[PDB]
RNA sequence: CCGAUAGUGAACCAGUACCGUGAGGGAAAGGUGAAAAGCACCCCGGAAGGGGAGUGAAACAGUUCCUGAAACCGUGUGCCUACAAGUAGUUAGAGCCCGUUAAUGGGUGAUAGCGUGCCUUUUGUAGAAUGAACCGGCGAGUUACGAUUUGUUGCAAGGUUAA
RNA sequence: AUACUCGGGAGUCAGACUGCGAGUGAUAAGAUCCGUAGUCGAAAGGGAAACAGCCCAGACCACCAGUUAAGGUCCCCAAAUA
RNA sequence: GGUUCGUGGUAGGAGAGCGUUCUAAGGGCGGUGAAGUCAGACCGGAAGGACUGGUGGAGCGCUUAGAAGUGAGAAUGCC
């Protein structure tokens, strides 16, 4: 019926992935891929590979029609955070969260 | 306690100005790996009631067993050689089929060995009869010779 | 040994202070408020 | 023997947070503000079990007043009339007649007028 | 036809076949209960009480003897370390009205 | 200088009502048959949709 | 339990027309507030609005006892520094009587969302002619 | 007696790493499965990572992998919400949506009444006094020996042993 | 319907305002210091808009019953346009 | 078992209890699913306690007594 792909622990902040994933949620996969191609954000290429993986899964594992697919679900979940430090003035160090994302895309017929 | 925990000698940071709670040692009891505030210390829990109360207690537990018909007095009890099979057969003949304290005087070393591997059964001298050993056991089996020795003391 | 009843009145549960306000001995734990007698190790010598 | 603080704490705090179901934001999630919200809800509910009794008597009286003024009586005269006439019907029952059986209410208002 | 009866320190309006909840009455679940204090009878001939209609009675059969849904009563005084929690379940009798007389 | 109170989830989410991207301005080409930004050259065909290069 | 509660659109709201000619500004207003609120109906429910619509005509002839015509001041503040404007009840009865009666009745309505709905049911006219004939308004006496 | 914030500082290559010129200070960090049977092969992808297929009792046990709470972050949507002035509830209450440990039930809440958090400290604090970002864990009248008093039990002009 | 005695266990030793009687002060102070009564402190409820200390009055729990207190009864707002 | 008078409360005195870990004895549950965890409209005057279902995958209640590292929301607490 539907096909999912996930990109786990991608080194991009979830907020930055979500602002893009919100454009493709509900679109036909052809339009979704165009939207990602012409959205100049660092998340666009990453989300494109998850979406094209989901479509390949739908065509190979579940013999679905790639011409009739819609993005049923798309969401970003928090992955494990890398903890870093930036030296600041007066010997003080400030925390830096190098956040990671789990990016899920589900495609379905209609 | 906070004195016995490794390290912890220095004040972790100055009393005033850092904006942190004032702290005296990293082994103060509210610190993660810190000293325990009271907690167990090695001590004896032993105490004896007066002798007269201890004698009344053994007299009363033994009288209870007679009232409950849980005391079996045996003429002899002896075994030619240490044999658990024989001791087990004996307990069926006497009709125990419960935990039982066996009290014996006429040395009979073969009784202790023969009953050593049975789970609910304890064999004791007679000199060694105690309130807690009688209480821990349902039936009390005692040889005539042992009864004499118990009455000789009480 | 499964039906032990110590003589009635011979044993009493100890009072534990500083275990909440319901007990009536919570917070200040029977010491009232401040002064020398509220402090750990507090109190003047006997006479 | 050591007693670690296992489970009793979580069980107690979770009950308080469940009593704060429906409260806004942090108030239905976090033990510290949920516990305040639940204590305060119980205090209001205790106060409002008393206030409810006052509120409903004010409602009934206002409805009896309206129905009685349609019979050229004020509430103060009608109630005096019913007392003199020896009629013990309470304000909740009068207010019910004034809305649901006005003919019956009018019969009582006549009994009141007669006694005045 | 409906009556107004005095039960449990309160007044209630009753028609036949109605199911009312009142303060606990003596009565097993079969038992027939007779309300003698009728304040008013309605329907095409309003019998009014001064204060009770002589001879007028409502009969009902006890359907349930129950305890209402659990109420928690909780008081506290801020800053005085005073809290008091108490459970409450008010007993009631569920009657079906049989006949206004 | 500093927040007097932490910002609630609701208030944070209301503030972000306008923090979003717009869809790109694109349409299907005739010669290519695939999507392209208007007023841009189409790489699928490999030139400007109209003007050949 | 069993106490009746009016539902929205359950109780028939009627249109009343009230001549203001001579009546003290209050006295008219206090009676009208009660009609708008629905305090004269046994169906009165405090949270619903069971009241009637009121047209006041001849508001220019409204009564002001004593020296109220010159001495009763109505104040407005714009919320700009020193932005306090004042009008006498007299001047307002001459030029803006619809405003005078609205101010007087607004003050006697509940100060809440429902009070603001009740105010919308009041129609004040300086003269004797309204344009609400379609609503078949019935004359009401105080 | 402890059972991984406990118990040693140290269950693990710990007096290590790290800090300090130095004396010295001094951590964190346990758990795949019975067995590696540790995922052939196919597919998308540069890889990572996925989806199948297979192994297995289980893979939502997949090389840090028993369980997996809360804060916190999201997706979906039953009810409400853009004329309202809100310690956020509570009491009354339509409407709409449900259907339970079956109960004078559950969710939501137009509108109406009432309503200044918790703690500490104070004569008095909603306080424009103090403390707490939140969640979790840990975190404070104990033990020994004496004194005294009450209760209990044994014996009683006696009672009791210490080493 | 309590007193007293003997034992065990306390807390308290910053008080506040109001009325009355005094001093200090200016016959000032929400001032200060005594005496005397009350309330608060440690008291929720009603009134005094709001308002520890004023007026009324003491909350064991439930009720969609009733009668009263101070204070009120044209509207906000229950009750007299008595 | 009735009658009568009571039942606001800080410091504080007095009483009765709930729950936690461990021990003993008795009696049980548990791969036909233990503890834990999640959910629920159930029960008790309170502390609290069940039941049903999901998850979990091997231990745990109950009764009576005993012993305590026995209950946290605040310490500019510690991690
Ligand atoms: Mg530097
Ligand atoms: Mg030291
Ligand atoms: Mg700070
Ligand atoms: Mg330690
Ligand atoms: Mg106790
Ligand atoms: Mg106390
Ligand atoms: Mg506290
Ligand atoms: Mg203190
Ligand atoms: Mg003191
Ligand atoms: Mg350790
Ligand atoms: Mg652990
Ligand atoms: Mg350590
Ligand atoms: Mg992992
Ligand atoms: Mg609107
Ligand atoms: Mg407006
Ligand atoms: Mg702070
Ligand atoms: Mg002693
Ligand atoms: Mg005085
Ligand atoms: Mg003074
Ligand atoms: Mg004080
Ligand atoms: Mg008061
Ligand atoms: Mg008030
Ligand atoms: Mg106060
Ligand atoms: Mg009353
Ligand atoms: Mg009266
Ligand atoms: Mg009125
Ligand atoms: Mg009382
Ligand atoms: Mg009390
Ligand atoms: Mg005590
Ligand atoms: Mg356990
Ligand atoms: Mg768990
Ligand atoms: Mg502890
Ligand atoms: Mg904390
Ligand atoms: Zn083209």
Swiss-Prot record, chain A:
PANTHER family: CHLOROPLAST 50S RIBOSOMAL PROTEIN L22-RELATED, LARGE RIBOSOMAL SUBUNIT PROTEIN UL22M. HAMAP family: Ribosomal_uL22_B (MF_01331_B). One of its GO terms (cellular component) is cytosolic large ribosomal subunit. The keyword Ribosomal protein applies. NCBIfam families: rplV_bact. Keywords: Ribonucleoprotein, Ribosomal protein, RNA-binding, rRNA-binding. It comes from Listeria monocytogenes serovar 1/2a (strain ATCC BAA-679 / EGD-e). Part of the 50S ribosomal subunit. The gene is rplV. This is Large ribosomal subunit protein uL22. It comes from the Bacteria. Belongs to the universal ribosomal protein uL22 family. Pfam families: Ribosomal_L22. InterPro entries: Ribosomal_uL22 (IPR001063), Ribosomal_uL22_bac/chlpt-type (IPR005727), Ribosomal_uL22_bac/org-type (IPR047867), Ribosomal_uL22_CS (IPR018260), Ribosomal_uL22_sf (IPR036394). One of its GO terms (molecular function) is structural constituent of ribosome. GO terms for biological process: translation. This protein binds specifically to 23S rRNA; its binding is stimulated by other ribosomal proteins, e.g. L4, L17, and L20. It is important during the early stages of 50S assembly. It makes multiple contacts with different domains of the 23S rRNA in the assembled 50S subunit and ribosome. The keyword Ribosomal protein applies.
From Swiss-Prot, chain B:
Keywords: Ribonucleoprotein, Ribosomal protein, RNA-binding, rRNA-binding. Disulfide bonds: none annotated. It comes from the Bacteria. Residues 1-26 are annotated as: Disordered. GO terms for biological process: translation. GO terms for cellular component: ribonucleoprotein complex; ribosome. Residues 8-19 have a biased composition (Basic residues). One of the primary rRNA binding proteins, this protein initially binds near the 5'-end of the 23S rRNA. It is important during the early stages of 50S assembly. It makes multiple contacts with different domains of the 23S rRNA in the assembled 50S subunit and ribosome. Forms part of the polypeptide exit tunnel. Belongs to the universal ribosomal protein uL4 family. Part of the 50S ribosomal subunit. This is Large ribosomal subunit protein uL4. The lineage of its organism: Bacteria, Bacillati, Bacillota, Bacilli, Bacillales. The gene is rplD. The chain holds residues 53 to 206 of 207 of the full protein.
From Swiss-Prot, chain F:
Keywords: Ribonucleoprotein, Ribosomal protein. One of its GO terms (molecular function) is structural constituent of ribosome. It comes from Listeria monocytogenes serovar 1/2a (strain ATCC BAA-679 / EGD-e). One of its GO terms (cellular component) is cytosolic large ribosomal subunit. Belongs to the bacterial ribosomal protein bL32 family. This is Large ribosomal subunit protein bL32B. PANTHER family: 50S RIBOSOMAL PROTEIN L32, LARGE RIBOSOMAL SUBUNIT PROTEIN BL32. InterPro entries: Ribosomal_bL32, Ribosomal_bL32_bact, Ribosomal_zn-bd. NCBIfam families: rpmF_bact (TIGR01031).
UniProtKB/Swiss-Prot annotation, chain G:
Gene3D superfamilies: Ribosomal protein L13 (3.90.1180.10). InterPro entries: Ribosomal_uL13, Ribosomal_uL13_bac-type, Ribosomal_uL13_CS, Ribosomal_uL13_sf. One of its GO terms (cellular component) is cytosolic large ribosomal subunit. GO terms for molecular function: mRNA binding; structural constituent of ribosome. GO terms for biological process: negative regulation of translation; translation. Keywords: Ribonucleoprotein, Ribosomal protein. This protein is one of the early assembly proteins of the 50S ribosomal subunit, although it is not seen to bind rRNA by itself. It is important during the early stages of 50S assembly. Belongs to the universal ribosomal protein uL13 family. Part of the 50S ribosomal subunit. PANTHER family: LARGE RIBOSOMAL SUBUNIT PROTEIN UL13M, RIBOSOMAL PROTEIN L13. This is Large ribosomal subunit protein uL13. The lineage of its organism: Bacteria, Bacillati, Bacillota, Bacilli, Bacillales. The gene is rplM.
């Amino acid at each position: 019926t539907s096909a999912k792909a996930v990109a786990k622990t991608v080194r991009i902040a979830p907020r930055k992935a979500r602002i893009v994933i919100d454009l493709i949620r509900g679109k036909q996969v052809g339009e979704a891929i165009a939207i990602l191609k012409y959205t100049p954000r660092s998340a666009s290429p990453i989300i494109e590979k998850v979406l094209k993986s989901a479509i390949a899964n739908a065509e190979h594992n579940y013999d679905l029609d790639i011409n009739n697919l819609v993005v049923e679900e798309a969401f970003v979940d928090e992955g494990p955070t890398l903890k870093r430090f930036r030296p600041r003035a007066q010997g003080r160090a400030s925390a830096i969260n190098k956040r990671t994302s789990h990016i899920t895309v589900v495609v379905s017929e209609v | 306690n906070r004195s016995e925990v490794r390290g912890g000698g220095r004040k972790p940071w100055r009393q005033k100005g850092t904006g942190r709670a004032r702290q005296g040692s990293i082994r103060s009891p509210q610190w993660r790996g810190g000293g325990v505030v009271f907690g167990p210390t090695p001590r004896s829990y032993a105490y004896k009631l007066p002798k007269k109360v201890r004698r009344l207690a053994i007299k009363s537990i033994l009288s209870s067993k007679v009232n409950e018909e849980k005391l079996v007095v045996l003429e002899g009890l002896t075994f030619d050689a240490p044999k658990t099979k024989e001791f087990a057969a004996f307990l069926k003949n006497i009709s125990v089929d419960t935990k039982a304290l066996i009290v014996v005087a006429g040395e009979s070393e073969n009784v202790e060995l023969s009953a050593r591997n049975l789970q609910g059964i304890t064999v004791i001298p007679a000199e060694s009869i105690s309130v807690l050993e009688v209480a821990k056991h349902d039936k009390l089996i005692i040889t005539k010779a042992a009864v004499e020795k118990v009455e000789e003391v009480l | 040994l499964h039906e032990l009843k110590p003589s009635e009145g011979s044993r009493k549960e100890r009072n534990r202070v500083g275990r909440g306000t319901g007990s009536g001995n919570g917070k200040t734990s029977g010491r009232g408020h401040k002064g020398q007698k509220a402090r750990s190790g507090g109190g003047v010598r006997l006479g | 023997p050591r007693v670690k603080g296992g489970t009793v704490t979580r069980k107690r705090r979770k009950k308080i947070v469940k009593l704060a179901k429906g409260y806004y934001g942090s108030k239905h999630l976090l033990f510290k503000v949920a516990n305040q919200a639940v204590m305060k809800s119980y205090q209001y509910a205790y106060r409002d079990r008393r206030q409810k009794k006052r509120d409903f008597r004010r409602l009934w009286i206002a409805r009896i007043n309206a129905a009685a003024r349609m019979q050229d009586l004020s509430y103060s005269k009608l109630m005096h009339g019913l007392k003199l006439a020896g009629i013990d019907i309470n304000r909740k029952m009068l207010a019910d007649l004034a809305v649901n059986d006005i003919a019956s209410f009018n019969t009582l208002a006549d009994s009141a007028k007669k006694a005045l | 036809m409906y009556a107004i009866i005095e039960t449990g320190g309160k007044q209630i309006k009753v028609e036949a076949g109605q199911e009312i909840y009142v303060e606990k009455l003596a009565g097993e679940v079969g038992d027939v209960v007779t309300f003698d204090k009728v304040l008013f009878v309605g329907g095409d001939s309003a019998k009014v009480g001064v204060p009770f209609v002589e001879g007028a009675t409502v009969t009902a059969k006890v359907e349930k003897q129950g305890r209402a849904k659990k109420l928690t009563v909780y008081k506290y005084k801020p800053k005085k370390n005073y809290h008091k929690k108490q459970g409450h379940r008010q007993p009631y009798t569920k009657l079906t009205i049989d006949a206004i007389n | 200088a500093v927040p007097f109170r932490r910002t609630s989830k609701a208030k944070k989410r209301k503030r972000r009502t306008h923090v979003k991207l717009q869809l790109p301005g694109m349409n299907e080409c005739s010669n290519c048959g695939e999507y392209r930004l208007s007023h841009h050259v189409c790489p699928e065909c490999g030139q400007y949709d109209g003007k050949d290069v | 339990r069993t106490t009746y509660m009016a539902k929205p659109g359950e109780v028939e709201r009627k249109w009343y027309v009230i001549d203001a000619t001579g009546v003290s500004l209050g006295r008219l207003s206090s009676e009208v507030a009660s009609i708008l609120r629905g305090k004269n109906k046994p169906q009165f429910t405090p949270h619903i609005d069971t009241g009637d619509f009121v047209i006041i005509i001849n508001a220019g002839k409204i009564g002001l006892t004593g020296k109220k015509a010159t001495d009763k001041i109505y104040y407005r503040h714009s919320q700009y520094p020193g932005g306090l404007k004042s009008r006498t009840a007299g001047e307002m009865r001459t030029n803006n009587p619809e405003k005078l009666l609205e101010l007087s009745i607004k003050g006697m309505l509940p100060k809440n969302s429902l009070g603001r709905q009740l105010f919308k049911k009041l129609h004040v006219y300086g003269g004797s002619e309204h344009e609400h004939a379609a609503q078949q308004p019935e004359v009401y006496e105080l």
